[PDB]
């Protein structure tokens, strides 16, 4: 059950990766808009 | 000792989740303001 814990943490990591790429694209769009 | 690493990585995961929610809420407020 160490492995199931690790496996579920990997989906958490994947969700943070997703959130970060979403923010970067949008923040980049904000930075472009203002230049 | 693998368990404690996992416990400690979970504490890091909640910190990164916290930071992401913080950034989402503030980027949204920005995008909303500029419109």
């Amino acid at each position: 059950n160490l492995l199931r814990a690790i496996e579920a943490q990997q989906h958490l990591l994947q969700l943070t990766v997703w959130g970060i790429k979403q923010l970067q694209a949008r923040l980049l769009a904000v930075e472009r808009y203002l230049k | 000792n693998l368990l404690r690493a996992i416990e400690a990585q979970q504490h890091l995961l909640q910190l990164t989740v916290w930071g992401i929610k913080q950034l989402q809420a503030r980027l949204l407020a920005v995008e909303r303001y500029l419109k």
Binding site: N1, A5, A8, H11, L12, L15, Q22 | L3, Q24
Partner: peptide, 24 residues
């Protein structure tokens, strides 16, 4: 995938790990 889904899933998976942590 949307932020509503993302958020739901954070909770789901957070709960799981914590359960499973207590158990191993």
């Amino acid at each position: 995938m949307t932020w509503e889904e993302w958020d739901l899933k954070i909770e789901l998976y957070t709960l799981k790990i914590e359960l499973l942590i207590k158990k191993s």
